[PDB]
Symmetry: C2
Subunit: 330 residues, 2 copies
């Protein structure tokens, strides 16, 4: 309380039985290296209505893709509001929400969702409460919040398969991230979070790369050595919105050969929380948040071994500026 974004928890909000002002935010990842070839990543947030004649079922999240870093950004956000979108349930291996673009301004025509006229997304990652969405009827999605992020050719989402690579000659590099969330203590959201005296916070565990267990001359890397490599890697970590709430990791120092594919050639990686942990992602649709702590953790490199081998904590990383505030249009 009281940013207007809190309503994006619907229906898990106090007044759930029975448009207030369209908001927008703009985040630059690197305000010093602005280019016309940078991409503007655009996320919508809003509400699924049943067809007043109009019933509020759920908050929902719709990624548009990107557009070149061209034009005035606040007007690009205004165009996101005049978009007309319909959605139905569907399902493939899981429940899907199919959104259809009915109409959209010309400025949005080069992003993937608008170019394709549709988007089909995992419903548990994109809808607050899919159990609430009828399998039939006439449904509508109303965009009320627009969030744009300008990102330099840091392009860098690790392909999912590479996040699942594993083996007994490897360690799994991972981050134990805790996130403070601002919330009304009488909100039902509060139920699923931890309580400290510093406040309510969420826990996230995130796999960030891989390392070798073994020397150039066969066995075997000492912990001290491993931690020196981690230290040199000199991590910084923030919260962002880049097609959904996202964890940004930046190495300011060199990568080892195994860690190298897990970052762009400029030392950055972007992790969509909605794949990492879908319940944390949806919380952050609605509540302001910032990193409480980030500890870097080493675990064995197969889940079988994770089960029998204790984790090695090393150090904290800096917290690198994790984000924009929602504002009304003026």
């Amino acid at each position: 309380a009281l940013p207007s974004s809190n309503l994006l928890a619907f229906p898990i909000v106090l007044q759930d039985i029975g448009q207030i002002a369209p908001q927008y935010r703009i985040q630059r990842l690197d305000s010093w290296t602005d280019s016309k070839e940078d991409s503007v990543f655009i996320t919508t947030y809003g509400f699924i209505f049943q067809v007043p004649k109009h019933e509020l079922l759920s908050a929902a999240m719709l990624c548009l893709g990107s557009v070149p870093n061209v034009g005035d950004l606040v007007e690009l956000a205004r165009a996101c509001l005049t978009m007309v979108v319909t959605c139905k349930k569907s399902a493939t291996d899981t429940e899907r929400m199919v959104f259809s673009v009915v109409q959209a301004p010309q400025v949005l025509q080069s992003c993937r969702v608008v170019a394709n006229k549709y988007s089909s997304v995992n419903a548990v990652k994109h809808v607050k409460a899919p159990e609430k969405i009828p399998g039939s009827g006439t449904l509508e999605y109303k965009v009320n919040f627009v969030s744009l992020t300008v990102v330099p050719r840091k392009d860098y989402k690790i392909p999912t398969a590479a996040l699942k690579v594993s083996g007994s000659s490897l360690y799994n590099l991972a981050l134990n991230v805790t996130i403070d969330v601002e919330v009304d203590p009488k909100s039902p959201l509060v139920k699923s979070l931890s309580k400290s005296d510093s406040g309510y916070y969420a826990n996230l565990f995130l796999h960030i790369g891989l390392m070798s267990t073994v020397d150039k001359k066969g066995k075997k890397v000492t912990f001290d050595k491993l931690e020196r490599k981690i230290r040199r890697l000199d991590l910084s970590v923030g919260l962002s919105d880049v097609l959904g709430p996202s964890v940004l990791v930046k190495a300011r120092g060199a990568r080892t050969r195994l860690l190298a594919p897990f970052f762009s050639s400029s030392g950055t990686a972007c992790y969509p929380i909605s794949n990492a942990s879908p319940q944390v992602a949806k919380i952050l649709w609605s509540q302001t948040a910032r990193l409480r702590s980030v500890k870097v953790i080493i675990q064995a490199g197969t889940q079988r071994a994770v089960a029998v081998t204790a984790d090695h904590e090393v150090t904290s990383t800096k917290i690198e500026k994790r984000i924009a505030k929602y504002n009304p249009f003026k």
Copy 2:
């Protein structure tokens, strides 16, 4: 451990932490087998319980499947043994957050089930933990089993469709699907109401399930009509129930022959089983804690590609039979 008030079933404590602020072990058995015996028969075992932090603090409800043992012994003694298990857990991650359960002690009757044979299982956390965001990614944690749910069925009947055959799409196919609504017994004071549909009777949950594929043409030439498809589907003679094999799941059965496209969506004995925790993790975990039964199941035709679904209204065809005997049943103390 901790408590829950006398009015409601203990199974309702499996909502934790989604509860408004004494509990003994329980079991339930579902029989999908015939009354006679065979060694095609297996006992699938699901456990439900709580992850505690030792540093003794209750964090979240959780579910862990163990796999299956042969149908031998006394099933009430098999269930009792499930409580003797020692299980720790910790977070890990690959592409997604993982919960890793480590079986530290297990009784001899379980030694052949998958999770006990290996001494661990590593599961998608959002599907197996009510509130993964409340679990610390370090610290001392234990999984304590309090509910054990057994399902006896022949092995050949638990035909779960592999992910890829469920994504198979096509311009000249129809998406055959089920629109499933589920009545759930829940108290109105319970926080869980928020995410449910208000019924004239009570509360329901909506679930939309992809079930097979059908051709837009008749073999030897197009183009199948409103009426012929109805024919084929009524001939399929679909029946649908709930159960707890591999967690809360939807059982789907066809009495009739399958067309060439539908075949692989059913076993040679016309059965299929869809874990809800894949279709919808949120409905699945509701089902941990509340009793429930099918409210209604309509058969639906959508286009064969997602692109086309988006431009095409759903055509509702018929309802299915509801196996009134197969429901999300309640537990009994030992």
